[model samples]
Target: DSEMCKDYRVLPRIGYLCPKDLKPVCGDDGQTYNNPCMLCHENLIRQTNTHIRSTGKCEESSTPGTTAASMPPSDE
Candidate 1:
């Protein structure tokens, strides 16, 4: 773990700190948050189940490209 969100116990406090520092993290909901703390803040306020999908910012395309298999094959 990145130690940022490792301890869910400290998450509430971290969220309260309202850290304005920049350390972008991608959410499973396809959103790019300012930081892991902000991500939790968003989830708490917006009532979203979004979780840290990755460490850095999210990619532009959520879909798979013809060149790469970054996304799984669809049944279509």
Candidate 2:
């Protein structure tokens, strides 16, 4: 059975479809998503546990060259 976010639906035309509108949210992956649904879709594809950390675009990090390794410790 499909796990994680079950509220989403599958679409043959564009893979899994979650929402049709954009509200914008910041993902724990340090990325911005049109909405929480988009972030869930991303996690489904990448097999990640990224979640909504905040609303709107992610804030700029003062630390330069920050990568996954450099990201602060998380629940992952």
Candidate 3:
């Protein structure tokens, strides 16, 4: 997947997609949202761990267990 990382030049600031709704949460700037995993590690590790307890497998999921779907069509 590192090669996949090389394919796309991700900006310093990355937005995260909500696993449940598949909606994007804008940051304070109203354009970008911080990556949730990064945010989770920074702000709520304990709570995040609780959420991951059941799954036992911490893969890349929009929330924590499943991968986020594709982006919706938008003018932005």
Candidate 4:
């Protein structure tokens, strides 16, 4: 039994709903969520494992222009 439940309905922090922003993020479970709120909601509502790993679609490189081929060989 939950300490804050009476009608078996979970309550939200500030009422309900979130923004429609396009902030793409990847969860720890390899799933993509809309925003931080959406991720948390999925975890609370669907009771799933959805922790954030990194921002920006989780597939894009975190670096701006640095890549594997962009680096120069070290002088031996």
Candidate 5:
């Protein structure tokens, strides 16, 4: 027998890294490494077990279900 598909909602998470958190400089080259936080964030959140991994990019994942376009106007 054929089975019907069910619909479900998903929530998103956000991640970021700051320059200050990076190593000041590499001992051998004396060059500072750019913050890897953004890359790390993407890798971790995009993993197969995460919500956005199978659906969309990180930014779209963070967007709420409700938006200004869907809200009704209220009287002042």
Candidate 6:
């Protein structure tokens, strides 16, 4: 977990921290964040994991179907 935050893109020092509307970005670490601000507040600002991957509910995996039986029998 030490290198957890290392993965996330460190917020750049610029103008405008928080925004009026939140984009609702989902971190790749399977964590729900209100938005980048929320993520930075809890993770970066608070000193926790700082890695954001995607922008949706914690998805299971790109490769669907847990079992081969679930899908049509393979041509093999």
Residue 37 lDDT in model 5? 30
lDDT per residue, candidate 6, 1-76, as tens digits?
2233444455467522555776666665667576565665566554656556666544554456576676877777
* Residue-level lDDT tens digits of model 2 in 2-34: 233755555678786555677777888887787
- TM per candidate comes to 0.54, 0.56, 0.17, 0.47, 0.20, 0.46
lDDT of 2: 0.68
Q: Per-residue lDDT for 18-38 in model 4, tens only?
A: 457767677777776766556
Which candidate leads the pack in TM-score? Answer: 2
Per-residue C-alpha lDDT of model 1 across residues 1-76, encoded as one tens digit per residue? 2244445544544434546677888988888787767787666666766787888788755555564653777677
- Candidate 2: TM-score? 0.56
**Candidate 5 lDDT tens digits, 1-76:** 0001013223364324234554222111222223333333333444422111221123333466667755877574
Q: Quote the lDDT for 19 in model 2.
A: 53
Ranking by TM-score: 2, 1, 4, 6, 5, 3
Tens digit per residue, CA lDDT, model 3, 1-76: 1122223332347532223323222322222223333323322323322111122223233364333333455465
Q: Which lDDT values do the candidates have, in the order given?
A: 0.66, 0.68, 0.28, 0.58, 0.30, 0.57
Distance (Å) between predicted and true CA of 8, model 6? 15
Clashes of 5: 0
Candidate 1 lDDT score relative to the true structure: 0.66
As a TM-score, model 1 comes out at 0.54
Write the number of the candidate with greater lDDT, choosing between 1 and 4.
1
lDDT of 4: 0.58
In model 1, pairs of residues that clash are none
Model 2 spans > 4 angstroms off: 1-14, 61-76
